[PDB]
Amino acid sequence: PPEGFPEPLNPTNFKEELSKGLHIIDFYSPYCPHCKHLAPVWMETWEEFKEESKTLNITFSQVNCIESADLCGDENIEYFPEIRLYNPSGYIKSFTETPRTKESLIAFARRESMDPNNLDTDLDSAKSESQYLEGFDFLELIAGKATRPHLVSFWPTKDMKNSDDSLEFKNCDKCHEFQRTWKIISRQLAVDDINTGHVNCESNPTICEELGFGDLVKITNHRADREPKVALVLPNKTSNNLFDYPNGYSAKSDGYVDFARRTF
Amino acid sequence: PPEGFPEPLNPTNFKEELSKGLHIIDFYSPYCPHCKHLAPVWMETWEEFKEESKTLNITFSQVNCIESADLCGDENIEYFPEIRLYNPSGYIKSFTETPRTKESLIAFARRESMDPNNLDTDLDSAKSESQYLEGFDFLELIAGKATRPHLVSFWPTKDMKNSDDSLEFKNCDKCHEFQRTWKIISRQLAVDDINTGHVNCESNPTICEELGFGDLVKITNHRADREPKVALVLPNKTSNNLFDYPNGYSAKSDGYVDFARRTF
Amino acid sequence: PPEGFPEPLNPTNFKEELSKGLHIIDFYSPYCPHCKHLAPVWMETWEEFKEESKTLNITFSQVNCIESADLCGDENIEYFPEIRLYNPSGYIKSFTETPRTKESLIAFARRESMDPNNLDTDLDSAKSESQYLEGFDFLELIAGKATRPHLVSFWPTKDMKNSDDSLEFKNCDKCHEFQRTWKIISRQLAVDDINTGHVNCESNPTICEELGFGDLVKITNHRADREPKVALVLPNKTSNNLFDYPNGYSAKSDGYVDFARRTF
Amino acid sequence: PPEGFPEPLNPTNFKEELSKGLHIIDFYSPYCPHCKHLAPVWMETWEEFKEESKTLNITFSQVNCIESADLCGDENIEYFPEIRLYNPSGYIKSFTETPRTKESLIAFARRESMDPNNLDTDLDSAKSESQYLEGFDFLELIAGKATRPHLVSFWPTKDMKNSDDSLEFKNCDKCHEFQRTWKIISRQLAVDDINTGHVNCESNPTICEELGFGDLVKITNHRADREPKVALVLPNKTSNNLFDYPNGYSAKSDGYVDFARRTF
């Protein structure tokens, strides 16, 4: 066991400990097949994360649900082991991604530190990582020239230089909300070395029409409302390398990040 | 009570009554508000439905959850009242639509009589109600000349004259499947006097491209797969009259049927 | 007579004058009814055309067939007056249209200046005036929404965006040839403010089938060869506004132009 | 605004529109004093130029540098407004002349249509406008009997009847080239009703010696090389009516045309 490795949180510690910063907690059981296959991974995770832990305000913790059974009942633990993110307000989300490695847990903590809503930090202080793609740039990506995956967003505008520029979108109720979402997505995907890009569909009509985003190219009074679109570009493939975002619109970044991270 | 009005089903009747045809059952309690403002409406529904009940093989029934509390318990009745569609194989779906009127309930039975999957009847014996729309025809609907709502389907082909013609769709995994679905949709919506149409996007490149369906127009090597698109045209409106089907793909007709029927 | 108005050409200046550019010559007799009610219209024209004469390299000239009788004899003048188009190479055609006005004469030179064969200029340098019509565009024209006449060409292909694009036509020996003809037609008719358009029948199967161009819609092994079809659409009429080109196929643009220019 | 008046060119159509013919483009800003008295002159220019536009392959167009700020940065726009000539290969020259009227803009288009280098047309098909002036004729011009200005060229030869005759010039490396230049000058000045003339200095030794072109009069081994000289004759003036072309030799016609057009 690593030197400073902390004891599980218990009913004397839980609320006092979660009242500052972020916590990634392993609700585990000493009575579990898979949870002793997590334990040594956890401690190495903890050990390698010691430095960033200080600077990102994120702590890896544990709860033994046998020694704290009523604690785990309050937190409504359904399975073992269960990995969760808390902030000072309480539960946020679970980390179900498999298989659990030191790499995957570290990436997840880094990913979550860049969500401004988690510690209500200020997104304006940060740059958007989203890259301005002219039509030609986007076509190069799709010709198989990407060396990393690119989540690309498409907009009913011609004036977006940075994805967070102040812009007035016509017949697009969700466009402004999605600029916040897109910026958060760009920074979270940057940890996984997945690129992001934005396309001005008004300046790239033929490309956006061919791709099925033709409704973003032009004002029409038959469609009341339009939404920004998102698609994934796979690196170093010359065909079938373009995949539209499958789920519905969301104000949350999570669906888009996890889509961009899928193995295809 | 109407003259022939059957009394509620009981444990001596239930499984035996449901072994043939379709049943639309009102699981109620004699001591609850919504189930006593429903009660006379059911009797309205039943008596008006007598002639169709036999030719459509659908029965309106009721269950007193006091005299048959264990029945309602076995079927997992959660609320009162609960209106449900049953098969000889068992539960199919619930009728949550409000307000419950004699018109809405009759419409539902007629609609459900037209799902081939309910009684394993043969869809191939029926005409598709879907009408062939040229691009020009569709713009006329969208200029405000629709006198009824039109749910329209858009396809990556040019050869679709009847929506259920024998066709080979290229790079479209779901298309064959959705012909069955689109055909059922056209028939169920004919009950509510809602029209349906199909468009050959290959015969209509500019229209489908501008509509945001440009991927159906043409083969490209970057998209593995395309799927047919669905849009609703509101009748007699000259603007904001075109609304895309919002949810994801389904092989079930129901979301598409309900989207086409909801108030805008 | 207008100020700079030239004297008739005579045998000493005649062939060296026609040795450059295009010439429109009025072979007349001073003792002729129709040849002296042409005279002032000829002077109106010349003066009105002064500015265009320089940039188009077209000259209105005259020959007195009594004072240069051996000249008119060499050219085999049949009647008086006879209006002829010459290039440096010699005679080209006569202008038989009546009634002769300043407008008709101006139009004629402008029309002839865009025939590439007159002064062997190269058509590749020019835009085609023929506009791309999809099915909906064409049906709008025929529903009566055209405000000028439209001569329309119909083709066995789906790949024609500009009427002069590089294309490989299947089972159509004349199509490549007719592309030049059609381009010259579009530019000559543009002088008379008549529009021209082209239709891809492979992209508009049902519209073209209904119109009687079904042989262009699809490859078949019954027909060895197909040719492009030509039809005229009259402006501002809601019925009986479509007229097929009546004469045979020609590599010449003029039969097609003159058809498009008829009074209805 | 006139009926068919085109909208400004933008980054999506700009390079496509310029791929054919000549374009005279008004690069403007809506927040520019000078660019708002041009706007109505521009729309007038366009409307009266509609007919010649077709036959000369010359189009008036615009780019708003507020709505197309990056295009104008790519085009290196320095001031507003900036009127420019483009061919398919790109920028040619700017139109800096003031004050801009409908007449000056039209005249400029006609002049540019007669430059063989702009659309690479064939100058040999056209006549030279340059008139043969014997010594006496030129002395008449200079006595003030010219009724239009006369740009006159002086040549080391005795054999020039037409300025584009096939000739061997002695000790004049540039003479052949300048025959092309002088021919272009003659046709372009013909648009503005400025005459051109040519003089054989070998046939007119005293006039040519006296004007300072004595070097063109006879073969001498003092000078390696001689060049044809150019002078302007002002109309209806009896003195100070003779002006040497002030700048250096050019194979380009533009300087000679502009000097001949200067008001004194």
Author numbering:
A (entry chain A), B (entry chain C), C (entry chain B), D (entry chain D): 29 to 292
Paper text:
One of the yeast PDI family members is Eps1p. Based on amino acid sequence, Eps1p appears to be a four-domain protein with a carboxy-terminal membrane anchor. It contains two Cys-X-X-Cys motifs, one in each of the first two Trx domains. The second Eps1p Cys-X-X-Cys motif was also found to be extremely resistant to reduction relative to other PDI family Cys-X-X-Cys motifs.
The refined ND-Eps1p structure was used in turn to solve the structure of S. cerevisiae Esp1p Trx1-Trx2 (SC-Eps1p), crystals of which contained four molecules in the asymmetric unit and diffracted to 2.37 Å resolution. Indeed, the SC-Eps1p structure revealed a different orientation between domains and a different interdomain interface. The interface in SC-Eps1p appears to consist primarily of salt bridges, between helix α4 of the Trx1 domain and helices α2 and α4 of the Trx2 domain, burying about 990 Å2. The distance between the two Cys-X-X-Cys motifs is about 46 Å in the SC-Eps1p structure. The relative domain orientation is the same in all four copies of SC-Eps1p in the asymmetric unit. Another observation regarding the Eps1p Trx2 domain is that the dihedral angles of its Cys-X-X-Cys are relatively uniform in the four molecules in the asymmetric unit of the SC-Eps1p crystals. In contrast, the SC-Eps1p Trx1 Cys-X-X-Cys dihedral angles show greater deviations among the multiple copies of the protein structure. This observation is consistent with the burial of the Trx2 Cys-X-X-Cys motif and its lower temperature factors in all four molecules. In addition, the proline juxtaposed to the Cys-X-X-Cys motif is found in the trans, not cis, configuration in the crystal structures of both Eps1p orthologs.
